[PDB]
């Protein structure tokens, strides 16, 4: 019953992460004592990274609290300068998204008991990263 099979086959495919890119400029603003990244969701979305993760990292580095909009926006409970955000953000890219072998930024992020790995969709290599 290839039919049965093929049916499931096609289903996984259309469940994949698209096919194969500057980085959208991360829009940031201020409202009292908050810094808000309008597209924190889209941004993360286009680097194949979970929001909680960029959030956790970016927040930890900031030493500030915050969560995400119901409409994918980052509300950092602290008014920080647009600049430092980027500085800490690129650092996030370097350590958790960029491939060591070729620097693609076109990667996945495995996880196992206590070892996470960056997985390049181009070169195919795995940069082991400090699970955090």
């Amino acid at each position: 019953s290839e039919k049965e099979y093929v049916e499931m086959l096609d289903r996984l495919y259309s469940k994949l992460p698209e096919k194969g890119q500057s980085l959208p400029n991360m829009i940031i603003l201020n409202i009292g004592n908050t810094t808000i990244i309008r597209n924190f969701a889209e941004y993360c979305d286009r680097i194949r990274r979970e929001d909680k993760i960029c959030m956790k990292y970016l927040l930890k580095e900031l030493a500030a609290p915050g969560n995400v909009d119901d409409k994918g926006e980052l509300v950092i409970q602290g008014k920080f300068s647009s600049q430092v955000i980027n500085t800490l953000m690129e650092r996030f890219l370097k350590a958790y998204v960029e491939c060591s072998t070729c620097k693609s930024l076109d990667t996945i992020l495995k996880k196992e008991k206590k070892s996470w790995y960056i997985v390049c969709l181009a070169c195919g290599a795995q940069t082991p990263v400090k699970p955090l």
Partner: protein
């Protein structure tokens, strides 16, 4: 509100090496099994992984997006609570050619399994094949062939192989087995698998009247260092009840038991003890039955169990009939070629006095051929083996290139 119940069936996960059969076991249970790590401690001293999960269903959603693993039901865009179906546990098997003898041991705990098969490599691989026919011999009928890592292969390809995995299947005991293609890494089509194992591997009937019999694959000392003298726990034997059932405050015995060679020949005399407690994962019970790795806390001196000592043994009701033999007759059947090798070469005849490795339950032992008729041989086992019932199955391996290889099986004639 779901029931805290013990495993119902044991589904092992077999296959080659690097083929994802661990990433998969968690792409299901959501648990990372230590089969792939170095452990200096209590417990596992063999490369075997374990992973329990619950299996519910939301009769409010559609298949396969229907089945869940947690009480919740968000995973289908609904809320009408899903009904608890069963509770299953996977045995994580070592796909490495060397380690093969510790697979045949995980198999003797297997109830039904899944044969993982990578899409990017040619089919079938050495252990992919070996492991397969291993299942055949040991006695499993429930088999689902998982097609993994397609998220790195062309649809045009995943199909190409599909065809083969199938023709390979004709005439085999699993001639009409499923082939649920997935992506354990991306955790995609896992639900289609959960419907598969729900559809093709169903809890078997447990004759709870037979003689209680458990296969041991580990042992340890629980007591932390320092523990006062009054909070000391007896040894803990772990494994799987393979038939019947035991319950607390009972009368059990471990075989062959304690070795005793004093002033003559050596001999193994049973280790008698009472069951101190029962546990499946983090939940304590009052009786253990087939399905799931058990933890039978006993009463004996922790020394006896502390080093995965009692692995390769069996636990029985103190009062039972279980011959611990040194010499055994076996109506063996040899194989075609040496599956699991590379140089497809025929299996030479069991010559007398030749040495062979015999798998028999959680146990593994070497012996020397003393008789060699048409379809029956007799062997001298260095360590005796406890045969819980006449004509139990045994796998026969023969070291070939410094490496041990499977060449047959037989029935142990008590």
């Amino acid at each position: 509100a779901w029931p805290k119940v013990q495993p119902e069936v044991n589904i092992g996960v077999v296959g080659h090496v690097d083929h994802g059969k661990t990433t998969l076991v968690q792409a299901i249970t959501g648990i990372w099994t230590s089969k792939h790590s170095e452990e200096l401690k209590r417990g596992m001293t063999i490369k075997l992984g374990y992973a329990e999960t619950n299996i519910g269903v939301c009769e409010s959603c559609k298949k396969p997006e229907a089945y869940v693993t947690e009480p919740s039901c968000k995973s289908c865009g609904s809320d009408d609570e899903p009904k608890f179906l069963r509770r299953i546990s996977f045995i994580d098997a070592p796909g490495h050619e060397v380690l093969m003898a510790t697979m045949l041991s995980g198999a003797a705990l297997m109830d039904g399994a899944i044969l993982v098969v990578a899409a990017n490599e040619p089919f079938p691989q050495p252990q992919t094949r070996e492991h397969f026919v291993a299942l055949g011999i040991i006695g499993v009928k429930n088999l689902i062939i998982v097609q993994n890592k397609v998220d790195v292969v062309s649809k045009e390809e995943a199909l190409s192989q599909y065809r083969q995995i199938k023709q390979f299947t004709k005439g085999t005991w699993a001639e009409n087995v499923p082939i649920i293609p997935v992506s354990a890494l991306h955790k995609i089509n896992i639900d289609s698998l959960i419907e598969g194992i729900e559809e093709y591997i169903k809890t078997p009937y447990r004759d709870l009247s037979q003689k209680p019999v458990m296969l041991v694959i580990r042992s340890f000392d629980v007591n932390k260092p320092g523990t006062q003298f009054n909070e000391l726990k007896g040894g803990v034997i772990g494994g799987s009840i393979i038939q019947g059932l035991f319950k607390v405050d009972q009368e059990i015995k471990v075989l062959p038991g304690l070795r005793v060679e004093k002033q003559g020949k050596v001999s193994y005399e049973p280790i008698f003890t009472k069951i101190s407690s029962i546990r499946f994962g983090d939940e304590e019970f009052k009786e253990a039955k087939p399905g799931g790795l058990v933890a039978i806390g006993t009463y004996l001196d922790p020394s006896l169990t502390k080093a995965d000592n009692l692995l390769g043994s069996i636990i029985t009701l103190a009062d039972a009939e279980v011959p611990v033999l040194w010499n055994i007759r076996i109506k063996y059947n040899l194989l075609e070629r040496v599956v699991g090798a590379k140089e497809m070469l025929k299996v030479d005849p069991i010559r007398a006095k030749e040495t062979l490795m015999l798998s028999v339950g959680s146990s593994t032992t070497l012996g020397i051929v003393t008789s060699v008729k048409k379809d029956e041989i007799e062997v001298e086992l260095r360590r005796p083996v406890a045969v819980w019932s006449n004509n139990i199955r045994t796998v026969i391996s023969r070291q070939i290139a410094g490496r041990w290889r499977m060449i047959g099986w037989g029935l142990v004639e008590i």
